[PDB]
Ligand binder design. Structure first.
Ligand SMILES: CC(C)CCC[C@@H](C)[C@H]1CC[C@H]2[C@@H]3CC=C4C[C@@H](OC(=O)CCC(=O)O)CC[C@]4(C)[C@H]3CC[C@]12C
Ligand SMILES: CC(C)CCC[C@@H](C)[C@H]1CC[C@H]2[C@@H]3CC=C4C[C@@H](OC(=O)CCC(=O)O)CC[C@]4(C)[C@H]3CC[C@]12C
Ligand SMILES: CC(C)CCC[C@@H](C)[C@H]1CC[C@H]2[C@@H]3CC=C4C[C@@H](OC(=O)CCC(=O)O)CC[C@]4(C)[C@H]3CC[C@]12C
Ligand SMILES: [Cl-]
Ligand SMILES: [Cl-]
Ligand SMILES: [Cl-]
Ligand SMILES: [Cl-]
Ligand SMILES: [Cl-]
Ligand SMILES: [Cl-]
Lengths: 315, 315, 315
């Protein structure tokens, strides 16, 4: 059993969670509402560099597999559940782009338009091609989160009009996913094993949509508030449904679940700036504290379970 | 056959219809657009007291059954069609709360926040628990109307922010219900017998949503108008589809159908205040006249059929 | 085989495409953004008269069949796929009404209210009756486009309030159609033959809705922009999915596909007026050029294939 076979596409899950952490701490240092913490922006410098190293190493190793064992890649593509992970490498690169650590880049009004085109295009072509396969042969193949994220990148460039077009496309696909998935949610028992990639974008897409609305227009309306509150209601359902009595075991799939929690925390900070008050401030800090704590303990657990015991990679 | 067995949970239907009548006549006396009628506010005083008596008597008798024959209550819970009626006792109490007869309460800016918490919480816990049962074992178990009604109560207290959160949650559940129920509407023949509790909230939830929007913001927009017009279009479909040639017979289920009609009438009065004109005024009065007439004739019929013949309660 | 049997209801398809062309060229002559072309309004005079001749001839011949062979009409009604075409004669008359060639009518603020009632009523009665048949015996029987078109006619009369009511009804039916049709789109192979009437209103209803919003309110908002962008995204999917390598053959069904393209072009012109700029202007002209070119080449092809070879009408 060579190492290439035991290396699946699920490795990209860890990069998405860690990269999403970078945007959270950037806000905590550039938030006028949360100025009283005096958080040093140097934290983002370490986190952003760490996200680049893991993304390059993961991507480079996977490229070697694609030339060495193309047939293995071909087999993975067809399987229905693990298809969504093909979108993961493209969407994560956009997350680093919006971070854009202040120290590296001298102050400028907008980023160069060339950056948007290179990252965005491979995603749009993949979205249409993967959608066509479903018709030839649920509706879980559709990608929703990436379109909302691209709108944020487009707003940073300054192309306001195209950002509105991407938001409309992302919303339309959400309706089909929302109706089907809500009817049959996964059972509390054996939650991580079943439909783990698909579920993550169910508690995350609304929170991303609210952030995109704030960048395009600049003022909160019913779109940003209601989408944010829907995500909060869905997030609360996890606590009530999860069984505290039932035991839990370590699994690689836990890395993907981190990403939904982080996106909600960033969205809450936007709400606090628009509407000041003691309620919002405490709620924003609480969500951030839970998100960052889970990553730190999970990072230690996934580090020990891979080195001394080499149980991270199954046969 | 003891009286406890022949006493079902459908008795709560009559309370919902009569309690909804109270809010209608309160508006008719406090509407600047309909000032020319000079309606005495004393009508609400009689109606509100009458609603309290029936609600207490119905609730007190049912509590006796729950301790005497718990297993009978347990059997009723599982059956799919008659599950929605468990939400009915909680939602109706909120309807009396908004009425708040002026004579009883000295003029005050807002009501005490404690009233909102006691009534609302048992409903939110019930909504999550009942929804979980569906996943373990359509989508008719979901409750939609109560969330919109709670927003009205929250606005009366003055907690504007939480009212927006409840409205978002209620809207999201409506999408699943609207798609499924619209595909298979009940046939005109044997209309009352089939799916009678579920259908009532289909012509009623839009009208409640429009009222909630007016209280939170204060100015009509596309939300209030389009939701109100959707309810009107759905209400008109009943007249066209119902068969006049086919005969009708007395049934206990008719009490639930009163509640949808009353809610639409109250919503129309809001429209008349925002947009004045002869068209709206006549339409508002016509809907109220039909609603109040149906209750009076139905009340007499349900009174005679229960006393001289004792045919109200089946075996 | 008498000519009456070989004359189907699909003949009304050609009238819808040609009549829709009339509104496009009217805008091109009355558009301040596209003033630099100096397009003579005389083009609409020829087109509008040509649309009236074909509509009268098609309608008059079909009336003869309805009295001669009523049973044949009765058989056609039941078949599920070819039911939507019954709505086509009524909706097309509204399209000529909005055109209202300037030369014929002296300048006036609004049109007489009587015109709206005569055309609209037969459509509303048909919508309710056809919808009832589905319940007694997908959800493709529902009509969506006509309600949005009627709102435009109502706005021309000046009855603003009723136009909002029609828009709400049309939107509600769209949700059921959008969810069902999007799940199972037709395959690229043998595209014209399968579900040809139903598909045409899928790329067309959003574009009609955006135009109606602009007339009722007068200022673009998120309704007009997002609905327009959804239609653009759906239109682009046709180019990617269609197979260029696969050959194509002449068919009568191609006339219906013209109508979706024209409606999108008219909607784009509205966008250019609201938001000026070089991007929008070129995109508006390009869509119009493709639409008008397709009609001209198709008109020649459908003319030659019917006269020398008499292959237009199948047995
Ligand atoms: C794909 C995800 C990100 C969104 C899924 C949710 C949408 C299907 C629905 C939920 C409720 C709907 C909203 C209902 C109420 C409003 C407020 C409505 O009225 C306003 O104009 C708000 C601002 C104001 O004028 O005060 C604007 C659109 C919006 C947000 C609606 C847009 C579509 C929403 C967000
Ligand atoms: C759960 C029930 C109560 C609502 C179900 C209906 C909604 C799914 C849809 C129907 C049409 C949609 C509306 C379409 C048009 C508008 C107007 C739109 O534009 C405006 O800003 C209106 C006010 C103005 O700016 O003039 C605001 C949101 C809204 C109401 C939309 C919100 C979501 C609505 C109400
Ligand atoms: C039946 C067809 C014609 C429409 C099908 C699409 C609708 C189901 C959804 C898609 C996204 C929704 C929209 C989402 C965002 C908005 C913007 C929202 O916010 C605004 O107030 C826009 C204007 C502004 O205030 O800047 C108003 C309603 C609207 C258009 C929503 C109404 C309902 C929409 C159009
Ligand atoms: Cl940001
Ligand atoms: Cl996705
Ligand atoms: Cl009220
Ligand atoms: Cl309910
Ligand atoms: Cl026009
Ligand atoms: Cl249609």
């Amino acid at each position: 059993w060579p190492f290439l076979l035991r290396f699946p596409i699920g490795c990209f899950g860890i990069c998405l969670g860690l990269s999403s952490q970078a945007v959270l701490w950037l806000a905590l240092a550039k938030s006028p509402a949360t100025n009283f913490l005096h958080i040093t922006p140097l934290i983002n410098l370490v986190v952003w560099l760490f996200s680049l190293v893991v993304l390059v190493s993961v991507s480079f190793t996977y490229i070697l597999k694609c030339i060495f064992y193309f047939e293995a890649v071909k087999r993975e593509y067809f399987h229905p559940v693990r298809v969504n992970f093909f979108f993961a490498p493209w969407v994560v690169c956009m997350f680093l782009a919006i971070s854009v650590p202040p120290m590296f880049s001298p102050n400028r009004k907008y980023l160069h338009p060339a950056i948007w085109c290179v990252f965005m295009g491979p995603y749009f072509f993949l979205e249409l091609k993967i959608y066509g396969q479903w018709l030839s042969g649920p509706s879980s193949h559709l990608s929703v989160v990436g379109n909302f994220v691209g709108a944020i990148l487009a707003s940073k460039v300054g192309w306001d009009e195209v950002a509105k077009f991407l938001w409309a496309v992302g919303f339309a696909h959400y309706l089909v996913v929302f109706v089907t998935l809500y009817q049959r949610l996964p059972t509390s028992e054996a939650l991580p094993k079943e439909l783990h990639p698909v579920y993550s974008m169910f508690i995350a897409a609304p929170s991303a949509a609210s952030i995109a609305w704030n960048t395009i227009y600049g003022q909160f309306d019913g779109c940003s508030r209601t989408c944010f509150f829907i995500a909060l209601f869905l997030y609360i359902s996890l606590v009530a449904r999860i069984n505290f009595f039932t035991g839990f075991k370590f699994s690689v799939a836990w890395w993907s679940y981190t990403f939904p929690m982080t996106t909600a925390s960033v969205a809450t900070i936007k709400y606090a700036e628009a509407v000041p008050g003691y309620p919002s401030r405490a709620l924003a800090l609480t969500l951030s504290f839970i998100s960052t704590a889970m990553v730190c303990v999970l990072f230690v657990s996934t580090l020990l379970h891979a080195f001394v015991w080499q149980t991270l990679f199954p046969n």
